[PDB]
Amino acid sequence: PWELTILHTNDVHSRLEQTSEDSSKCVDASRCMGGVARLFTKVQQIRRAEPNVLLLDAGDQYQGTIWFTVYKGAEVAHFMNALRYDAMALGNHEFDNGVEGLIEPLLKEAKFPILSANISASGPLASQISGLYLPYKVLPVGDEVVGIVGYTSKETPFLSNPGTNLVFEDEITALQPEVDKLKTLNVNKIIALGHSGFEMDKLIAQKVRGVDVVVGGHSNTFLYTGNPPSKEVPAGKYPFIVTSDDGRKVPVVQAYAFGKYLGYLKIEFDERGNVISSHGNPILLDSSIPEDPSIKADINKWRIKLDDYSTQELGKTIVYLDGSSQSCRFRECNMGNLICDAMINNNLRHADEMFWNHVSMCILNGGGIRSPIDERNDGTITWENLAAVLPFGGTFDLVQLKGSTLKKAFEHSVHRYGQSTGEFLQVGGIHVVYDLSRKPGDRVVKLDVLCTSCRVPSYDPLKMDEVYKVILPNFLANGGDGFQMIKDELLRHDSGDQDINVVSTYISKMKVIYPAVEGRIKFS
Amino acid sequence: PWELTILHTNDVHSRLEQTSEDSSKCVDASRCMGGVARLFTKVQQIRRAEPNVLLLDAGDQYQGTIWFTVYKGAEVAHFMNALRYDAMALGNHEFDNGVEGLIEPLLKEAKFPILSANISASGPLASQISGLYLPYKVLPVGDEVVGIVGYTSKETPFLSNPGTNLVFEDEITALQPEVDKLKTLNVNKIIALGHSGFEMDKLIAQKVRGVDVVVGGHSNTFLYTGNPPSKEVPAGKYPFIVTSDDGRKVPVVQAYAFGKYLGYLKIEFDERGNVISSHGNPILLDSSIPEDPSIKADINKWRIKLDDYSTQELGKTIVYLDGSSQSCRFRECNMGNLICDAMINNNLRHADEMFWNHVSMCILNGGGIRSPIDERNDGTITWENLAAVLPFGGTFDLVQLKGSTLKKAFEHSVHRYGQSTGEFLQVGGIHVVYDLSRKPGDRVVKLDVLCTSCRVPSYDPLKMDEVYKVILPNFLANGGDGFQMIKDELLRHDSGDQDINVVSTYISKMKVIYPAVEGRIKFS
Numbered sequence A, B: 001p002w003e004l005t006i007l008h009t010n011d012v013h014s015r016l017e018q019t020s021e022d023s024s025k026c027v028d029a030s031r032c033m034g035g036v037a038r039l040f041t042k043v044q045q046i047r048r049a050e051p052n053v054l055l056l057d058a059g060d061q062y063q064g065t066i067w068f069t070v071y072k073g074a075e076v077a078h079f080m081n082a083l084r085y086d087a088m089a090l091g092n093h094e095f096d097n098g099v100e101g102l103i104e105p106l107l108k109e110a111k112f113p114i115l116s117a118n119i120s121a122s123g124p125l126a127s128q129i130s131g132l133y134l135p136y137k138v139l140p141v142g143d144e145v146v147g148i149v150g151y152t153s154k155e156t157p158f159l160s161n162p163g164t165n166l167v168f169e170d171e172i173t174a175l176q177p178e179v180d181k182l183k184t185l186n187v188n189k190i191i192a193l194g195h196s197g198f199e200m201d202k203l204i205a206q207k208v209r210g211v212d213v214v215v216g217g218h219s220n221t222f223l224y225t226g227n228p229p230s231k232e233v234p235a236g237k238y239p240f241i242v243t244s245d246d247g248r249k250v251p252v253v254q255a256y257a258f259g260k261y262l263g264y265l266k267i268e269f270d271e272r273g274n275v276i277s278s279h280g281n282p283i284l285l286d287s288s289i290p291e292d293p294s295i296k297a298d299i300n301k302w303r304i305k306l307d308d309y310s311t312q313e314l315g316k317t318i319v320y321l322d323g324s325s326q327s328c329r330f331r332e333c334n335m336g337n338l339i340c341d342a343m344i345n346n347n348l349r350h351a352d353e354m355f356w357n358h359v360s361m362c363i364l365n366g367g368g369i370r371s372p373i374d375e376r377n378d379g380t381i382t383w384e385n386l387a388a389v390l391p392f393g394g395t396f397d398l399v400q401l402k403g404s405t406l407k408k409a410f411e412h413s414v415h416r417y418g419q420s421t422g423e424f425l426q427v428g429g430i431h432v433v434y435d436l437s438r439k440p441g442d443r444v445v446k447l448d449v450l451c452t453s454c455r456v457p458s459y460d461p462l463k464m465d466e467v468y469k470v471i472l473p474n475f476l477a478n479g480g481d482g483f484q485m486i487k488d489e490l491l492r493h494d495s496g497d498q499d500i501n502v503v504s505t506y507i508s509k510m511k512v513i514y515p516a517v518e519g520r521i522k523f524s
Ligand SMILES: Cn1c(=O)c2c(ncn2C)n(C)c1=O
Pocket: A365, A367, A368, A369, A392, A394, A422, A473, A475, A480, A481
């Protein structure tokens, strides 16, 4: 039997430095985790011991911290080249800075193949991009070869900025002929590496004949066999075994997100490329593993430009930005209006004749707004100021919610009004009226929402059975601040851009901001 | 007696081409008026007949048509140099593109002195601008000399974009020492040429000892002795005689606006520089005066770049821009919200610790919105599209109104609701609720306005005795669409920027717009 070691990361999301336990800023180094210097140590160790090793990334290196804001992907090419990745699949966030911000910094600078079989271009762009990403690569491994076929979320146009040329094809439809073609070229060991989420990974394992292993991403899925090593709760065993339509057992793996874990799967193949066995587990990259000193020194050198950037002017405000708890946990506050407006602006994507924009609505718990910004520093706003308001290193995500769920959320928002609790909601594209003289649970007396399926945006009553797209913190999509109804009832959830980066982009674009308190939230 | 002919223009406001009777676009050439080609004919004629002639401009050449949008003052330097102006005073609108847009195109390219005695600079800007404008110029005229002393509205920081360095001093305080100094240099014939408005011109005539003639602007004041030649109603005789504190008679002149008239004042002086007599009248520049063929040919050549600019993309909309009468004369319409938002953005000026901005409020009669803009031309908006919405060539002006006046205006807005009349108001920084079941005159049941004297903008009830700044069309400041209460009751009125230019600037800055109907106007 020929034994392959697959080492894999996904959704690293700009966690170049070691992080806290919850993948925010590292404060107590003896409890910090991940980062590329520690990943380098562990990959180097495994490559010393195991003969046949591939190091794979299933996409979404782009987006998540100030590293991406400043270096725009040059950090990804540099540090992935230093760790000697063997292949990467394109994720949705690789399109955040458009095609041009993918071609230049990543596709031209990576020393490893970048893959996606389900993205096609036309016109001049097809000539410009030809060969800079590939459907698959056949890689030598010891005295064998392994085919790696890539795939990217078909939902990328809703979740990033790929532009109107590129077309994202159904993953299974695009993959099967490429896997068919590898079989005709005598490549009998095939890894599908891609970025569509755990549910689609299982469907690919089931339906794409000839795929031996699926290495995925997007859904930040944690799989584990045994007692979990940290706080993440497993969605299933590692690997997750799918019974294929061709009647094989196909292992499916993912490794959470944020560089906290290194996926590690050992596959035994027979002489005909059939998987005889598969076993492994993700490795927690905790402080017991030292940071490679050379990578850490390069990381500290690259940090200098980040520190310099963090105190530069992004834009100006001519208004005080009231992010005080006394405002934002009790009533409409202008800092909440600013952040929700920035969240909606971040989610303007290219539209059908069917909507002016696919999403119009935002909610933000006042518990998430942690500072005001004073306008009397010559109106200057810096990144450092925004990091005081939004200190948790979260994302602003897209969810689909029934109107009944969202009405429940607005009831939760005031269920114990008066105590300075964090669940009080700041909004965009939503007008709510409360009557606090009613029983908890029955205090929302008006709730109107901004249409999407309309050429002129206007407000309509919320409908209980209708499914709304909403931009909201990752923290609330995960039921934070008591919003269990959101976690339990949401129909779709895709992670979005870093919270600070959303607001800093909007302020940069606007140049001069003056958000008002304007009646989005009233009390009767 | 030594006889001087003063020819003078003021508030020409980018009317390089001949205009209609009401100073909008020329449609029936046999009834058109003004423009620099006709002004050239008439000035040339007078210079052939009269020995001692000065051609003076009292400021506000900048701003008013697409000529300024595209050429940014290069057209002013070019055509004023062709007509051989002898001197110009700085107006407020000369600061519309900041100091840099005054230095370069006008102060560096004018072949005639540019004057203002009441503007001072400090730091590097004082070195950069030194001598490029002057307090006064002594000009040879035949075998005599005439001193010309300049002045500019002290209110320029509220009415344009001069920046935070320049300081606008009280006109009379700044002028007297300069006039004193000319007396010490044996210059006994002194013209005050400046841009502060008719009321301040009369105060200067009264109080600045040694001034013999005041040639002013800003207030678009029409003076006439006799039957008026056109539709403009005189504010007083030409010249308007002020009895000075030193007990002389001092003539004060102005010549309306828009290049429609050439001011013409004949002054007889005695050997000691005392005015013995003054007489004249503005000359209507009507079609009986031919356009100089050489200037007209240069005008037609420069127009090519205007026609080219007018079809270029300014920005995009992802929403239909509903400027239909069926919407904007009956309810809140998103095109009205766009234009009011653009009007408020145009009026962001540099602020004290005392306000976030000096003005927060806008009203726009639906009668002034004349077209929608379809978003299905790839979202493109051009100047030509905006000219369909705003076809009258007006300005968006700043007025001060008591809250009682503005409540009267909102009652007028719905006094005969239901007939598709133009007075129905679109708004910004104002939330109004009507109850149409009440008697005409008593239908406004809520009227809340955006604070200025506040660090966080929020809405408060309108107060009847408080004076509000409002941005609104020139047409309404003049009582158009039945708003007689605005014309009769306003406490201050300064003309602002061209209507189309305000909206095109905002769209350019924003890049992508998506104005909503959001509850600024409701019905109970
Ligand atoms: C209140 N709150 C938290 O307490 C929090 C968080 N992310 C992590 N934590 C712990 N966010 C975004 C938040 O709003």
